[PDB]
Each structure stands twice: as structure tokens, then as C-alpha cells.
A paper describes a structure:
We also obtained a map of the modifying compartment DH-ΨKR-ER-KR-ACP (3.74 Å) from the same dataset. Complex C demonstrated the modifying compartment (DH-ΨKR-ER-KR), with ACP crosslinked with DH through 1. In this complex, 1 covalently crosslinks the ACP to the active site His929 of the DH. Arg2045, Thr2046, and Tyr2056 (ACP loop 1) interact with Ser1187 and Glu2000 of inter-domain linkers (L2 and L5). Unlike the narrow and well-defined FabA active site, MAS-DH features a deep binding tunnel to accommodate the long, branched-chain acyl intermediates. Surprisingly, while the E. coli type II DH regulates the substrate specificity via gating residues, we observe a major domain rotation of the crosslinked DH in comparison to the apo-DHs in MAS complex A and MAS-like PKS modifying compartment. In the DH apo form the active site entrance resides underneath the ΨKR • KR domains, providing no access for ACP binding.
As exemplified by isoniazid, which targets the enoylreductase in mycolic acid biosynthesis, mycocerosic acid synthase (MAS) offers a potential drug target by producing part of phthiocerol dimycocerosate (PDIM), a key component of the cell envelope. Using a combination of dual covalent crosslinking and cryo-EM analyses, we elucidate the structure of mycocerosic acid synthase from Mycobacterium tuberculosis trapped in two distinct catalytic states during its iterative cycle. These structures reveal domain architecture of the acyl carrier protein mediating condensation and dehydration through dual site-selective crosslinking of the acyl carrier protein with the ketosynthase and dehydratase domains.
Residue numbers in the entry:
A (entry chain A): 892 to 2106
B (entry chain B): 1626 to 1687
C (entry chain B): 892 to 938
Write the structure that this text describes.
């Protein structure tokens, strides 16, 4: 009786053209038990092999046997909760070509899981076989295929039992396309193989072969998933099969992307059963997104947090040692004396301590003899603390020397301290406002001289980990009580700041850019140009002004100062991130505009400056200054005020067109207007009254209907339901209507279309139906209908002259008073956030006019990634250009064509440098070289003058001079300290002073990751780099532009890069070029771009660093018990959501490989909709509630998604 | 660029192909009652470009 | 009991505008012999 296919289910034939085969059925687990086994992160999912088999069955049905499919695609995954209706449909679009698409229409929306083409395109040409005795003997070297499957399952996507068959394999090597596995249907799958054209389980295993084929030694943290195949063909039933050919053509070694496999299924005899060509796994995103991700997973910063002291008190017997060092101040006693007194009093038990008051450059014998007074017989007694005391709040030009002396003092004293045979004491260090913490009491007034210390102490903490190197920053208004408490029983914390009456601790935080660090600028609407544009299409709460750098008009252009624009349904659609993009150019907000001409183009003569103007344009009209094509603007006749003109445009310009120049409305012609109360509807009402027609209409809620009836227009009916057609039919005796200015979608469309009576005109202005392939029934057209479509914006862009004439006509008519402008309700343009809300919910009637603020309203606008980077008419100076990264950055600047970049270094260039310079000059860059030591003020003055006196103002700088050197604590010499100190400190300070007056746009100061991380390789470099870090913070505090970068190493794999990646030079130059070009635009002062999130030394930092917030978090091995998280609903559900926050962040951390905050967005760090797959599946498994890949996007922030889950679970709790 | 005026008289996939062909503002004039009286389901969407569909039948008009 | 209906073939809900139920059944004395006896007008006919 029943013979339906199991996956597809029913097959029903439609005779309507284009001929369509519609397949419907259930693919739930309850029906097909075996389906349950592709638990991706422990949740059932339909394998792509299922899509392949289903497409093959559809092709066989439509074209009989020996017909195959091409260019398959997979688009979304599935969930298969219990039951899952599936609606596979195939259409005969044109003879000889067909299309096949599978989608699920549950929950009220569709999801095109896979698209296909089933053109037969096959002939009676049997495929050739393969030689068993050859392929088997070629690659017999065995490999643990079953263990490979087990590890691949552990990787996150399990296979269960039904998807077995893939047998222990053999290959020439791990990394070659030679895997020789064997495939057989598991016992539970052998039975029903007849119905299928090759079991989806067998095809899935055949695919799965690619998992072992790619790389047997797969790297941890990588996930792959098949995505589409270029072609397919099924030759014979797979009642029996042995192996699938392992022909792979992967362009691998990038970790992901594809593999372009061509699997061929063949039996024991060598004959082939099914052929697949062009198989790709895990495509990911475009190259631009790859570079964007590479920036997320590297930017670092010093994150500070507030906490309480868990020490409370313990251990006792705090007989530490103290040294009052470099305290040349008149009265630096209080800090040391108070600390000693608190230690004596509050310190439990005996707390004897002594002071080795080694002042700055006290006396020669103090180097050793002065220290041995206590560091000889009782050295390293139970703990030591260094106190540095206060200092002046601002730096003098000569203050640099003092910092050098301080670093010399620290290196000497610490080398002496570390030279103790017995176990070393923990090295406390208290410094006064030498570390910049956070917006809470942080900014200017940082003690620069002490600032360089941080890097040295941090490198020490790695060089000699035995002496725990905790260092504490302190503030005037913190009081010494909790400071003494930290001294006494301080827990294992490395770097902390007592910035106020509160404890602050540091955690190296992976902090990608966002929306709070975009460069802010001060603009004036009166003459400065700024635009409005949604930052995050979808949540209109993010509307924010943006600088627009008004460009002077060109030929055929005008420069109009907007006075008021109007919302329009296109604006609403774009605001909610729902516009039907069609030309890879997202439309800007606003369509119309009314303002005054401020400048005149070259080739234009229609109008002059100082004259009013109106019209619409693309490029966004929600601006203070707008530059639109001159041909697309109409002078305002004297009658119209600005308000009337803005209200009329796009209301009459639509209504007048549709009803007059297309439908040719005449006296006594029945008209039907949908959504009359809207602006377009109101214009239509006015037009109909003017031309003398019977004005039917329909509205929304009853209040609007009553209001419209108050206007005198009789025959008002509800628009929500289709009932209006019948009612109007009753009230007209059959002659329903002659014109329909439809603007609603859905069933109403058909009713309106059928309403017309033998005259025919259907002007359609809606947008939902047309961009949806609404596929209307064409039968009602038999009675002389005529269907129009009227998209005013598109007409304006393509046929400016016609819309220009139309606009002139409507304005002239409005001035004469024959037409009345609709009702208006102004809003301040800065308040667009709520205004858009009214339009969508339709509580306000009439056109919403936005009144752009054109006044002296001084404000802060935000410059997006489109920021001033390479401006032609300015000079750029690069220091140390003649060596290392300088050459590469100089070449990059030349490529950008920057104007007359100045290049300098400390010495004459080498012959290769001269060759590169002359070549770049020949390339067209007007680069000029200089020389001299940057540590000299004269050199800086000469450099700044040369770049300025040349005639091109200097605005960009890049101080990159540095030389890499290696040293260890003991052998660190003073000359090394000086030669590291001068290039960074003195050069940078001189550059800042000399350039202080110029109109700079950035200031890039290079640094090393050592100052941030701490590498035993070098310690002298760390001090100078930390100093330049703090100096950059201070400069930003002063308000001048600045940006400090801490570079790192080249490879993320260590020395294995030579074998696995090959010898390469520099520090990932191309990778860092984009990072620099981006980071120079944003505002954050300090940032560390270093290859972390997986790297050799990270294994060491996590151990030696008590902060180490990056962690490893190797606890992803969830199990069946993990469900208890749902069972924790016994506790209060609000508190349950509070803990759900932590669940979410922890689960996200493993996939992201780093701890993220709960306030930012997941998309910021970068997830290829595969990190999204993991997150969604894990959320469902750990909570039993599902969130669609759509609703996750809007709630991209951890807080948002947590609140959404809390609500969607409290609803269940209520049930 | 495509065509502008299409005085179609074919049926089946021919008219569907024609409707996609014409450029912006093209006016797809129709005279062949065959497809229309069969309640063909026109793939309304090529109207994206501001097309206009007419049906012309001399006898009924008269 | 049996999902298919003898006089209608296979039920299918098409989620189009408007929603349609399309069945595409088959009938015939060749397979549904019980129709043969109702030979209306001395010719095979649909009851």
C-alpha cells in the first residue's frame, strides 16, 4: 500500500505552470530513530548527507533514473527536537532546467536549509572503475580509523552508532590524500536500505572519511562541517559497498576553508556506485572578515577590577625587611614610618623590621657595603618591601634623567636582593600614583619617573619567579590601614592599585574595540557636517550622529544645508535592519530633504546660492550638509514654506504620480486607498477630492477609522481583515472600484486586485510583496486589468528628469492650494530613536518630519572607522624608517600615496636601504630622508621644521625607533639601560614637545609585549616601554591625539613554525599593517597587539601569573549529568538567571578561548556562525530552551541573551 | 540593458522569461489570453525594477 | 489507520498564499477493482 520515501515522505504532483513537485514529510527523531546520532554538542542534527540523498531522490522522481544534480548547497543546520515537518519542493522553472529547495516553515518563518539544481545532464556513458589491487597496494600503511572517529566525536560532533561503517583506515601518510578506509552499513541500518538511494548514514560516513583524510593529527580547537557539493551522480544501488575513493584536492594548511573533495563510492569489484565532485567543508567568511577576526584575537590591555581582600589576616610573624629608597624629598618619612608603625601594631606576633635607607645615588660604598649591613647576616628575612614615596605631579623636560636614575637604582637593588643563596623573600613594592588604573580616579598626573619601574618588575617576576614580585600602587586618598593589611597577609596578587579607599587589581584583559572607543570629535552643525546612521541595524537604540566631512560640490552638484527631512517606510525598513538589499549598497537613512543651497556646482545653472530647494536623493538626507546631484533638486516656489514642502514631497510625489500620471484618474472614477491615514494615503485622499472621485478608503484600528470619517471621507472599512472587499462590493452594486492605491501586503493584495471592475488599474507601492516573490494568481486580470509598480526612490535614481518634473508639478500645485499637504508632527532629529518607533507601531498619523538641528549646538560627534588616516595635503614623519619595520611602513605609506613623508633615523642608510628609498621615490612617493639622534632636542626641532617648512603641514607621526637586545637580570649593565632608555623616553618626549603645536591627527608610539607580558629575554627594554606607555596615557589625558602599541613575536607556534610554516622574516608584517591602520583610528591610548590566545609562552604566564585571566578552561567535556543545570530551577528563577549569566559566559569562554565580559557582544570577538552553532547547541543542552539564530543576533550581548533566556524560561515556570 | 516594451503573445515559460527581460520602466503589454485564462501564477518579483503589466483584449474592450 | 487515503493519494499542505491543500490522488478499476462493478450506462464510471 504505502510506498512513500522515508525522508521526503509524500510526493504530490502539481500541474500548474511552472510545473512543481512538492514533497512533504516528517523528519523527526521519533519516526526515524537512527537519525538520533549526529548529536552536534549533544543535540540531534540532520546531516548534510541527508540533504544529498533527498536531492538525489527528488532528481530520480522528477527525471526518472540516471538523472543527477549539480551545485548543491547547505545553508542552515537543524535541531530535530521530536517532530520536524519538512517541505522539500522542486520547480520546473524552464524546460531542461529545474530548481530544488528544502525548507522548514515551522514557528512562522521559513529557512532555506539547502538549495539545489536537478538538471539531468547525463548520458548513457557508464563511469570507469578503479583497480582494487592498485589502490589497496598504493597506500596500505594503516591508521587507527576508529580512534580517529572517536577523537573527532570528542571534538564536538558525535556520530553515535547508526553513523558507523567508517572502518579503520590506511594512508600513505597522515597528511596525504590517501586514506583507505572501509564502509559498511551498521546492523541496525542494513534493513531498510531498499527505499533509499544509498543510505544517508552511508553517505555521511563516506563524507566523514574527509575528517581523517584532511589531517590525522588534527589540531585542538578546530572544528569543521561539510558544506555543499559542486555535483553529484548516483549510478547503482548500494546494497553492498566497500570503500569510497579518497580523491582530495584540498588547498589546506590554513586550518579551515575547504578541501574540495571528490568522493567516489565503489564496491568490492571496483565499480563505482555514486560520484560526488567538489565537496567543501567549513567555508567561513571572506578574507576581510578573516583579518577582522585576527585583530580581535590579539588586542590586549591592562584591565583593572575592584575586589575585597580575602586575606582578612593569617600567617602572623610578619618580620619583614624594608628599604626607604630614593627618598630625596624633604619629608618622605610619613609613608615609611606609618607603614612600619602599622606593621608593628596590627602585625600579629613578632614583626621586627629594619630600614635600609638607600637614597638615590647615596654614595659609592652603598652599592655593596651599605647593603651588607643587613643583607649579610640576616639577608632575606621573611619578606621585603620597597617604598618609593611621592613625587611631583607633572614632568619637566629634564625629569627624564631622574627616571633613568630610578631605573638604575631599581636594577642594582633588585640584582643585589636576588643574590641570596637561601629562599628569596617575596618582593613587595609600593609606588605612588605611578600606574594608570581606570576612569575612576585616573588620567593626568602620573609620576613618569617611577612609571618605567613597572616593566622592570614585571620582567623580574618571570626571570626569578621564586621571589614573588607583587607590586602595589598607592594613592594619597587611600589611607595606610588597608595598605598595611595587604603588606601583612597579602594574598597571591601581583599588581594592584590602592587608587582610593578601595582595592583595585589588574587582569590582562583581551579587549577588542567597540563603540565607546571610536574617536570623538567636536562639531558645530552651523557649518560642520554630520550624519545619522544606525550603528547596529536591528536595535534602533544605537542611532548616533557621525561626522560627514562635507565635500565641496562638483560638476552637476549642489551643497544644501538641510532644514528638515521626513521619515519614510524605506527609512523604517533600513532602521530595523530589514531592508531588501539588492545592490550591495546599504541605503542611507532618509529619502527627502528641504533646505537652502549653500554652494553651487560647476556645470549647473538652474539655481544659485542662497535659494531654497527641495527634492530627494540617495546617500542619506539626515545630514546637516547634503551634497546631491543638481539635476535631482527642484526650486521651491515662493508659496510653499519648508514644512509644506517636506510634508508634500514623497507623499504627493507618490500619490500624484500613481493616481494621475499612471492611472489617469478622472471624474466619477471609483478609487480605493489603503491605509488612508498614512501620509501617502492622505495625499491620495487630497488628490481624489481635487480630481472629483468617489473616495473609498480603509484604515487600521477603529480610532483611525473614526478620525478619517471625521474628515468627511465616507465608506471606511477595516484593513486588517480581508472583509473590506465584500463590504465595498455591497456598497457599489458590483462595480467595485476603478483604481486601487494598495499599500498593504498579504491576502489584502488579492482581494484588492479582484475588486476592480472591468476598468482596471492597480497602482502598487508596497514593498513587502514584490521583494518576496508573492506569486499572485493571474486569473483576475482577464477583465482588462493593469498592474503598476511605483518605487519612487528607484525611479529617482534611474530617471532623474521625470521625477524632477513631477516634483516641480506637485510643488506648484501645492502652492496654488489645489492640493493640501498632509498632517505633520515634528521631532528633533537627535530624537529619531523614538520617532522610528511611532512609524512602525503606527500610533501617529501623518508624515513624521524630522527637524535637523542647524544651530550653534556645539556637540560631540563620533568618527567611525572611516577616519582621517591618509590625507593628501599633509606631511608625515616616520622615525627609524631606514631599518626594520621602518622600511615596511614607509613602503605602505607610499602605497597609500601620502603627501611628502619625512623619514629619519640615527645613522646613514645602508646600500639596501638607499636602493629601497630610491625605488620608492621612483614609485611616485616624494619621501625625503634625514638623520640624527632623536634623543637630542635639536634633532627633533630640525625634523619638525623640515616637514613643516616644506609647505605641506605635518599631521601624522610614527615614532618606531628601537633596537632588539637580550639580557638577563644579573648581567644587565648601565650602558644597556641608557641605550634602551634614550631612544624611547628622550626621543618620544622631544617629538611630543616639538610637534605639540602642529595640527596632528595621530601619534603612534611603538612598544614591546614584554612590558605588558614580561619576557626573561630582556629587562632593559621593558622599563623604557612601560615608561612610554604611561607617557602615552598622560599625553592622551592632555587631550592631544595619541596611540601606543605594544608589538610581540611573529609565530604562535614557537620554533615549530620553521617546520610547519617555513622561515619568514619580521613580525607578521602584513598582518600587523592592517592592525596598525585600524588602531590609529580608534581612541584607546594603550593596546597590546600580540599573538596570544594560543602560543608557547602562554603556558608559562598562566602558571606564573596569578591574574592570567585568559586561562585555559579545558572543561568542555560535558556529559549526561550536565542537565542538572536545568534542575537548579529549584532556586529562585531570578537568581537562576543571575547564575545563567555566569553559565553563559563560561560556556562562551571555551569556544572563544578567552574570558569575555558580560556587557560586550559575542560578535565583537569573532564567531564564524560556527562558534554560534556551538553556543546555541550548548545553551539548548544545558537549559532545555532554544533560541533561533535570528533572535540571538539582536541579543548579541551576554546580558541581553541571559535576560531573554530568563524570560523564555520564566514563561515555562508559569506554565 | 534589456528591452523596454514587450508585446508578448506566448505562453508558459516564454512569458515568464520575457517579464524578467525588460529593463526599468519596461511595459509588459500582454495580448495572449491563453496563459491568463489558465490562472497562471506569475512570479511577481521582476516588478522590482518598476515594471508595469498590462492586459489588452480588443473584444472585451469594445 | 493508514496515512494515505485511497481516493485522494497523499495529503500535502502547501504553505503558499493562500494556503492550499493539494492531494493528487489516483483511481482506477485496474488497482481499485471495487469501482468496476458500478458500470454506469454499461460503461466503467465513477460512482
Amino acid at each position: 500500500t504505502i510506498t512513500v520515501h522515508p525522508l521526503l515522505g509524500s510526493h504530490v504532483r502539481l500541474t500548474e505552470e511552472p510545473e512543481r513537485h512538492v514533497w512533504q514529510g516528517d523528519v523527526g527523531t521519533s519516526v526515524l530513530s537512527w537519525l538520533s546520532d549526529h548529536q552536534v554538542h549533544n543535540v540531534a542534527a540532520l546531516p548534510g548527507a541527508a540533504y544529498c540523498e533527498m536531492a538525489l531522490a527528488a532528481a530520480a522522481e522528477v527525471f526518472g533514473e540516471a538523472a543527477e544534480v549539480r551545485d548543491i548547497t547547505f545553508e542552515q543546520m537543524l535541531l530535530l527536537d521530536e517532530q520536524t515537518p519538512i517541505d522539500a519542493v522542486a520547480s520546473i522553472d524552464a524546460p531542461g532546467v529545474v530548481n530544488f529547495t528544502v525548507e522548514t516553515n515551522r514557528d512562522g518563518e521559513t529557512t532555506r536549509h539547502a538549495t539545489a539544481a536537478l538538471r539531468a545532464a547525463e548520458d548513457d556513458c557508464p563511469p570507469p572503475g578503479y583497480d582494487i589491487t592498485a589502490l589497496l597496494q598504493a597506500h596500505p600503511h594503516a591508521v587507527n580509523g576508529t580512534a580517529m572517529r572517536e577523537s573527532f566525536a570528542e571534538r564536538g560532533v558525535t556520530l553515535g552508532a547508526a553513523f558507523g561503517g567508517l572502518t579503520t583506515a590506511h594512508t600513505a601518510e597522515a597528511g596525504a590524500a590517501t586514506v583507505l578506509a572501509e564502509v559498511a552499513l551498521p546492523a541496525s541500518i542494513r534493513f531498510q536500505q531498499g527505499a533509499y538511494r544509498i543510505h544517508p548514514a552511508l553517505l555521511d560516513a563516506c563524507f566523514q572519511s574527509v575528517g581523517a583524510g584532511v589531517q590525522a593529527g588534527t589540531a585542538t580547537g578546530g572544528l569543521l562541517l561539510p558544506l555543499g557539493v559542486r555535483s553529484l551522480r548516483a549510478y547503482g544501488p548500494t546494497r553492498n559497498a566497500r570503500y569510497c575513493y579518497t580523491r582530495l584536492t584540498k588547498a589546506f594548511n590554513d586550518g579551515t576553508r575547504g578541501g574540495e573533495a571528490d568522493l567516489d563510492v565503489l564496491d568490492e569489484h571496483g565499480t563505482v556506485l555514486l560520484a560526488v565532485r567538489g565537496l567543501r567543508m567549513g567555508t567561513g567568511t571572506s578574507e576581510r572578515d578573516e583579518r577582522d577576526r585576527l585583530v580581535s584575537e590579539r588586542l590586549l590591555t591592562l584591565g583593572w577590577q575592584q575586589r575585597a581582600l580575602p586575606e582578612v589576616g593569617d600567617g602572623e610573624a610578619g618580620s619583614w625587611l624594608l628599604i626607604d629608597t630614593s627618598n630625596a624629598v624633604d619629608t618622605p618619612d610619613m609613608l615609611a614610618s606609618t607603614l612600619t608603625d602599622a606593621l608593628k601594631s596590627h602585625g600579629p606576633q613578632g614583626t621586627e623590621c629594619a630600614s635600609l635607607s638607600w637614597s638615590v645615588q647615596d654614595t659609592p660604598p652603598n652599592d655593596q657595603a651599605g647593603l651588607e649591613k643587613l643583607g649579610s647576616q640576616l639577608r632575606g628575612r621573611d619578606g621585603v618591601v620597597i617604598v618609593y614615596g611621592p613625587r611631583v605631579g607633572d614632568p619637566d623636560e629634564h625629569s627624564l634623567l631622574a627616571g633613568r636614575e630610578q631605573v638604575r637604582h631599581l636594577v642594582r637593588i633588585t640584582r643585589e636582593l636576588a643574590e641570596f643563596e637561601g629562599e628569596l623573600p617575596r618582593l613587595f613594592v609600593v609606588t605612588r600614583q605611578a600606574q594608570i588604573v581606570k576612569p575612576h580616579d585616573s588620567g593626568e598626573r602620573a609620576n613618569l619617573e617611577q612609571a618605567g619601574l613597572r616593566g622592570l618588575l614585571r620582567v623580574i617576576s618571570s626571570e626569578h619567579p621564586m621571589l614573588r614580585t607583587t607590586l602595589i600602587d598607592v594613592d594619597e586618598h587611600t589611607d595606610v590601614e588597608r595598605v598595611a593589611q595587604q603588606l601583612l597577609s597579602g594574598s597571591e596578587e601581583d599588581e594592584t592599585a590602592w587608587r582610593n579607599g578601595d582595592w583595585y587589581v589588574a587582569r590582562l584583559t583581551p579587549s577588542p574595540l567597540g563603540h565607546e572607543e571610536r574617536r570623538t570629535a567636536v562639531l558645530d552643525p552651523d557649518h560642520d557636517g554630520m550624519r545619522v546612521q544606525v550603528r547596529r541595524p536591528g536595535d534602533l537604540q544605537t542611532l548616533e550622529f557621525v561626522a560627514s566631512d562635507r565635500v565641496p560640490p562638483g560638476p552637476g552638484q549642489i551643497e544644501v544645508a538641510v532644514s528638515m527631512s521626513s521619515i519614510n517606510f524605506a527609512d523604517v525598513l533600513i532602521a530595523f535592519g530589514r531592508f531588501p538589499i539588492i545592490d550591495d549598497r546599504e541605503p542611507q537613512l532618509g529619502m527627502d530633504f528641504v533646505g537652502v543651497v549653500t554652494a553651487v556646482g560647476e556645470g549647473v545653472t538652474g539655481h544659485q546660492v542662497g535659494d531654497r530647494v527641495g527634492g530627494f536623493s540617495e546617500g542619506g538626507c539626515w545630514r546637516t550638509f547634503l551634497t546631491c546631484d543638481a539635476n535631482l533638486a527642484v526650486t521651491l516656489p515662493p508659496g510653499l514654506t519648508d514644512e509644506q514642502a517636506i510634508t508634500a514631497a514623497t507623499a504627493h510625489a507618490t500619490a500624484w504620480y500613481g493616481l494621475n500620471d499612471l492611472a489617469q484618474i478622472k471624474a466619477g472614477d471609483k478609487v480605493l486607498i489603503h491605509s488612508a491615514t498614512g501620509g501617502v494615503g492622505q495625499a491620495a485622499i487630497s488628490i481624489a477630492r481635487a480630481k472629483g472621485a468617489e473616495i473609498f478608503a480603509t484604515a487600521g484600528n477603529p480610532a483611525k477609522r473614526a478620525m478619517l470619517r471625521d474628515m468627511g471621507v465616507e465608506h471606511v472599512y477595516d484593513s486588517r481583515s480581508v472583509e473590506f472587499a465584500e463590504q465595498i462590493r455591497r456598497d457599489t452594486d458590483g462595480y467595485g472600484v476603478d483604481i486601487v492605491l494598495n499599500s498593504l501586503t498579504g491576502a489584502a493584495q488579492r482581494a484588492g486586485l479582484e475588486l476592480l471592475a472591468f476598468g482596471g488599474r492597480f497602482v502598487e507601492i508596497g514593498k513587502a510583496d514584490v521583494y518576496g516573490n508573492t506569486r499572485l494568481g493571474l486569473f483576475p486580470f482577464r477583465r482588462g486589468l493593469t498592474f503598476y509598480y511605483l518605487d519612487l526612490a528607484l525611479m529617482s535614481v534611474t530617471q532623474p528628469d521625470r521625477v524632477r518634473e513631477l516634483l516641480a508639478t506637485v510643488f506648484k500645485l501645492t502652492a496654488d492650494g489645489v492640493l493640501t499637504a498632509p498632517q505633520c508632527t515634528h521631532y528633533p532629529l537627535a530624537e529619531a530613536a523614538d520617532a522610528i518607533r511611532a512609524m512602525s507601531n503606527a500610533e501617529h498619523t501623518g508624515k513624521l518630519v524630522l527637524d535637523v538641528p542647524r544651530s550653534g549646538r556645539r556637540s560631540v560627534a563620533v568618527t567611525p572607522e572611516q577616519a582621517p588616516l591618509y590625507r593628501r595635503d599633509g606631511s608625515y614623519i616616520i622615525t627609524g624608517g631606514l631599518g626594520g619595520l621602518g622600511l615596511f611602513f614607509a613602503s605602505k605609506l607610499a602605497a597609500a600615496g601620502c603627501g611628502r613623508i619625512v623619514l629619519t633615523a640615527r645613522s646613514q642608510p645602508n646600500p639596501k636601504a638607499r636602493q629601497t628609498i630610491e625605488g620608492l621615490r621612483a614609485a611616485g612617493a616624494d619621501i625625503v630622508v634625514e638623520c640624527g639622534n632623536i634623543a637630542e632636542p635639536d634633532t627633533a626641532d630640525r625634523l619638525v621644521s623640515a616637514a613643516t617648512a616644506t609647505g605641506l603641514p605635518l599631521r601624522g607621526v610614527l615614532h618606531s625607533a628601537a633596537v632588539v637586545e637580550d639580557a638577563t637580570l644579573t648581567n644587565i649593565t648601565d650602558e644597556l639601560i641608557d641605550r634602551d632608555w634614550s631612544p624611547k623616553v628622550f626621543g618620544s618626549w622631544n617629538l611630543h614637545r616639538a610637534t605639540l603645536g602642529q595640527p596632528l591627527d595621530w601619534f603612534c608610539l611603538f612598544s614591546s609585549g614584554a612590558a605588558l607580558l614580561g619576557s626573561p629575554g630582556q629587562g632593559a627594554y621593558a622599563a623604557a616601554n612601560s615608561w612610554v606607555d604611561v607617557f602615552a596615557h598622560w599625553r592622551r589625558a592632555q587631550g592631544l591625539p595619541v596611540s601606543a602599541i605594544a608589538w610581540g613575536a611573529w609565530g604562535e607556534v614557537g620554533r615549530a613554525t620553521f617546520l610547519a610554516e617555513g622561515g619568514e622574516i619580521m613580525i607578521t608584517p602584513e598582518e600587523g599593517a592592517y592592525a596598525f591602520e585600524t588602531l590609529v583610528r580608534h581612541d584607546r591610548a594603550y593596546s597590546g597587539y600580540i599573538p596570544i590566545l594560543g602560543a608557547p609562552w602562554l603556558a608559562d604566564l598562566v602558571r606564573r601569573s596569578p591574574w592570567g585571566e585568559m586561562f585555559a578552561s579545558t572543561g568542555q567535556r560535558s556529559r549526561g549529568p550536565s542537565k542538572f543545570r536545568m534542575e537548579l530551577l529549584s532556586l529562585p528563577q531570578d537568581e537562576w538567571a543571575g547564575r545563567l549569566r555566569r553559565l553563559l559566559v563560561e560556556q562562551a569562554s571555551v569556544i572563544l578561548r578567552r574570558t569575555i565580559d558580560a556587557d560586550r557582544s559575542f560578535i565583537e570577538y569573532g564567531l564564524d556562525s560556527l562558534g554560534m552553532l556551538e553556543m546555541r547547541t550548548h545553551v539548548e543542552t544545558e537549559t532545555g530552551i532554544r533560541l533561533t539564530p535570528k533572535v540571538i543576533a539582536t541579543n548579541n550581548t551576554a546580558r541581553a541573551l541571559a535576560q531573554y533566556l530568563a524570560d523564555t524560561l520564566a514563561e515555562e515556570q508559569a506554565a
